[PDB]
Assembly symmetry: D2
Homo-oligomer: 116 residues x 4
């Protein structure tokens, strides 16, 4: 599992459950090609987006639909979504853990990249 | 000043100086039209992006070239850039301050929306 | 102004106004002696804490009463307070800006150290 | 495992390994009593600080020795340490995950509190 995403709610102190996200990969012609998508589980995690074979070198974008999440909780947040854009696997294969911590007017995102 | 951006450097405890960014507005065909751009000053701020007449409701994206900034300092960054995408003015003009705090493998962005 | 504190509210996208804090300095018997205190203004800043003569090298703690702030807004917070503990002036006076960003179950604090 | 701490380095994009921390509990007489201590593992985690029996209701403080960590990496950081002070178990037993994300001049800390 070379790409995993973990989302936390900073207002309730819990995993952010059922957060949708779409992953794109930049194609040869400079457009974003749809790569994978899913929702966070009850542990605030999304596993199985991809595999070591399919997760080739390139520039990827993960767009976390944070606004629907806040909206379903009765909150109007600032952001339309949270986006993480990064070059992956450029020095060979890595495992990427992307973590997003959400507040209605703020978010942060961090990557842990481990050599496996 | 209806839209201000402030960037900070969590590795050095300083403003992030000379950081380039573009601002786009969502156009009705759903693409991103360039709107305003600049570099951060020595206080890590970028002002004068727009005015209140021109800054109408809509979806705006600020794309901060964080990767060039880490490269000039000689430190491998993770992100290509930091994006902030938001709906402005939901019901009327407020002032927006967007602050980004940068680390090579992490960033946070916050909005302060005042009256 | 050698030491300034700024607090922000990530739930509401505003300054955190009226937030109380005390500043302590580490005394040679290793206890924490009160040094300065205040509340944030309407811009979420607290200035005038000390002056450059009085603000000598040493270990300082800023203890931000974040729990009272969340209680007045009616939202259960996790932390008792936020603490920022740092060695000042390692080699000479610099200006310090300590910014705290508050959420009920999270906070971040950053220092901007300038010349 | 009612209390777990996870520390990440935001400069290298990795777990923060071998970070020491001490946990105190506030005693009846308003002093901090030593409660537990340990170091983060290779996954940046510290498990086994306590047990459900010993982890009674009270105000706890976790002091993460972030400065030694930065120092061992050749960096002079701002903070002496990162401290998390909180009331635990006041509405009955909970599981607390405390996460700290470290940069030399900044850190954040978040708690996830789950009912078990
Ligand atoms: C990241 O920590 C900081 C920080 O170190 C400095 C900051 O400075 C600010 C100045 C500011 C405003 C700000 O929001 C900030 C900050 O956000 C700020 C922050 C917090 C920014 C982040 C945690 C990404 C609003 C009020 C106004 C008077 C318009 O000017
Ligand atoms: C800071 O960014 C991260 C991060 O990169 C990894 C994180 O890992 C976590 C794992 C975790 C839990 C977590 O809260 C985290 C993280 O917080 C985490 C974070 C966010 C940490 C901060 C923004 C300080 C909760 C549930 C449980 C199932 C026990 O496992």
């Amino acid at each position: 599992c070379p790409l995993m995403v973990k989302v936390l709610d900073a207002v309730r102190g819990s995993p952010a459950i059922n957060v949708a996200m779409h992953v794109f990969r930049k194609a040869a012609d400079d457009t974003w090609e749809p790569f994978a998508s899913g929702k966070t589980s009850e542990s605030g995690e999304l596993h199985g987006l991809t595999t070591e074979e399919e997760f080739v070198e390139g520039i990827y974008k993960v767009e976390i639909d944070t606004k629907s999440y806040w909206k379903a909780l009765g909150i109007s947040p600032f952001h339309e979504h949270a986006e993480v854009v990064f070059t992956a696997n450029d020095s060979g294969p890595r495992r990427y853990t992307i973590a997003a911590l959400l507040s209605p007017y703020s978010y942060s995102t961090t990557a842990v990249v481990t050599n496996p």
